[PDB]
Design a protein around this ligand. Structure first.
Ligand SMILES: *[C@@H]1O[C@H](CO)[C@@H](O[C@@H]2O[C@H](CO)[C@@H](O[C@@H]3O[C@H](CO)[C@@H](O)[C@H](O[C@H]4O[C@H](CO)[C@@H](O)[C@H](O)[C@@H]4O)[C@@H]3O)[C@H](O)[C@H]2NC(C)=O)[C@H](O)[C@H]1NC(C)=O
Ligand SMILES: *[C@@H]1O[C@H](CO)[C@@H](O[C@@H]2O[C@H](CO)[C@@H](O[C@@H]3O[C@H](CO)[C@@H](O)[C@H](O)[C@@H]3O)[C@H](O)[C@H]2NC(C)=O)[C@H](O)[C@H]1NC(C)=O
Lengths: 49, 97
């Protein structure tokens, strides 16, 4: 186990249906920042470096 | 009274359209090279998130201002080779190859 950050989608019936890493690629971290699974085109600012 | 002769005036006009868009890293400023600040900042939360959204939102408008003024033509026209047109010497307003 490793200290990470995930993001979980619950359904109507309180079931974990989908997850995402915040560490594997910049694309998933974009999903972590905007807090959405589907992302339209464009640039989006995220955290610093 | 009715005027007979006339004159022709050219009057200048100055208007601002934009402003230098900025950006601020938090930890370079509010922390400033110390990890323990960054070990303390996370109690306050993602205020770095909201201000980056705000300042970039200003930055989107600054390009939006310039674009909404200028980008109105749809053909990129060519400057003619002549610059003097029947007493109309455009030698100061047109560019020069
Ligand atoms: C439309 O308007 C433009 C306005 O710029 C005008 O162009 C200018 O014309 C004058 C002459 O009428 C030019 O002045 C001369 O240009 C030549 C070439 O550069 C220079 O060598 C000359 O310098 C010598 O001669 C002078 C007097 O004998 C000396 O004082 C000097 O030290 C040199 O010995 C002289 O400067 C000027 O350069 C142009 N400028 C431009 C940007 O073209 C044009 O004539 C007008 N046309 C019409 C049809 O109205
Ligand atoms: C969340 O859970 C509820 C129940 O725990 C789910 O409702 C159930 O959905 C199924 C699928 O449609 C239903 O089965 C069908 O019912 C219809 C109508 O009676 C019948 O014609 C079909 O042949 C089939 O049997 C089931 O009846 C229904 N039960 C209840 C109590 O509503 C619901 O779909 C779940 N939703 C999610 C997003 O998980």
């Amino acid at each position: 186990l490793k200290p990470t950050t995930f993001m979980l989608k619950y359904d109507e019936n309180g079931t974990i249906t989908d997850a995402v890493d915040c560490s594997q690629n910049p694309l998933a971290e974009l999903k972590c920042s905007v807090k959405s699974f589907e992302i339209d085109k464009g640039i989006y600012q995220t955290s610093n470096f | 009274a009715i005027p007979t002769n006339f004159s022709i005036s050219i009057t200048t006009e100055v208007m601002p359209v934009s402003m230098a868009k900025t950006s601020v890293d938090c930890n370079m400023y509010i922390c400033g090279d110390s990890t323990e600040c960054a070990n303390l900042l996370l109690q306050y939360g993602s205020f770095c998130t909201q201000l980056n959204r705000a300042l970039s939102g200003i930055a989107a408008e600054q390009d939006r201002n310039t674009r909404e003024v200028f980008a109105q033509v749809k053909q990129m026209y060519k400057t003619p080779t002549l610059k003097y047109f029947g007493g109309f010497n455009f030698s100061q307003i047109l560019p020069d190859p």
